[PDB]
Amino acid sequence: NPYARGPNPTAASLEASAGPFTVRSFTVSRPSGYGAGTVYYPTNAGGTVGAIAIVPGYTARQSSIKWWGPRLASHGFVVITIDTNSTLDQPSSRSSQQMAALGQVASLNGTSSSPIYGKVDTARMGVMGWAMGGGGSLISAANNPSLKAAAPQAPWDSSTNFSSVTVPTLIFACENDSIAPVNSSALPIYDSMSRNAKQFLEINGGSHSCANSGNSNQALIGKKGVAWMKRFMDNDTRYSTFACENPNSTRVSDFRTANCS
Ligand SMILES: COC(=O)c1ccc(C(=O)OCCO)cc1
């Protein structure tokens, strides 16, 4: 596997606050079609890595999703967290902005003054995001089936039919979400997807912000997000158990998975 990076994973190494690589970050000078961005990248991955773009929910900014930047980048990914053009953008616009941010990561990979010059394998990309940004990630996956992985959290879209999605998709859900209730949002979205590796991980007692920065389940949520991205962005079957397993955890009120290997 030419995409495999880093030491062999263990539960401990995936639950830790940081992975094996050192992370640095920068602010995007001229965002291409979105509001603002921060790029997180490993300084010592030892080969090119995939890129992941992460979008917040309605009203929200990078702070809500920023913890993913160092968590993922320290396991060997370039991660861009964005602010949208308006905090009040809807899922479709969020998806366009998310893909523009991936395009700009690809640009920076080819820009000799960038810290990520030659760090990115632009053929291997993923999408994440919270709430309307989670709906935007599912729209991105539907429209761009060559994306390698999606892992939205507490997603919402005014449509729940994502039978279009063929990209491996992990849905984080929050049991007690009152803003995008699981039974009308995350779960029907999950159930709609028929052609992909997929997983549903609902956090016991979680509010709508249960997978955001500052959450109290970073060990489990970070292990699953990293494992999913490693398995599917890097084709890295060292992560197949971590990606596919039911954690059998008292922190999880609902687990489902299909077509996972
Ligand atoms: C029925 O659905 C809605 O009312 C709704 C409202 C807000 C959002 C959202 O993006 O929340 C995340 C906060 O940043 C998603 C769905």
Residue numbers in the entry: 1 to 261
Paper text:
Specifically, I. sakaiensis adheres to PET surface and secretes a unique cutinase-like enzyme that degrades PET. By hydrolyzing PET, the enzyme produces mono-(2-hydroxyethyl) terephthalic acid (MHET), TPA and bis-2(hydroxyethyl) TPA (BHET). The enzyme is named PET hydrolase (PETase) for its PET preference. PETase adopts the canonical ɑ/β-hydrolase fold, in which the strictly conserved catalytic triad S131-H208-D177, as predicted from sequence alignment with homologous enzymes that exhibit PET-hydrolytic activity, is found on the protein surface.
We therefore produced and crystallized the double mutant R103G/S131A (DM) for complex formations. A comparison of the wild type, S131A, and DM crystal structures suggests that these mutations did not significantly alter the overall protein fold (Cα root mean square deviation = 0.144–0.2 Å). Soaking the DM crystals with 1-(2-hydroxyethyl) 4-methyl terephthalate (HEMT) and p-nitrophenol (pNP) produced clear densities for both ligands, and each compound could be modeled into a shallow cleft on the protein surface. In DM-HEMT, the ligand is bound in a groove containing A131, H208, W156, I179, W130, Y58, and M132. The H208 side chain is within H-bond distance to the ester O atom of HEMT, W156 that adopts the “B” conformer is T-stacked to the benzene ring, and the other residues provide hydrophobic interactions. The proximal carbonyl group lies adjacent to A131, presumably facilitating nucleophilic attack by S131 in the wild-type enzyme. Judged by its binding mode, the HEMT in the complex behaves like a substrate analog. Therefore, a fragment of PET that consists of two terephthalate molecules linked by an ethylene glycol was docked into the enzyme based on the DM-HEMT structure. The two phenyl groups are located on either side of A131 (or the catalytic S131) with a kink of about 120°. Notably, the conserved W156 residue shows wobbling conformation and only W156 in “B” conformation is favorable for HEMT binding.
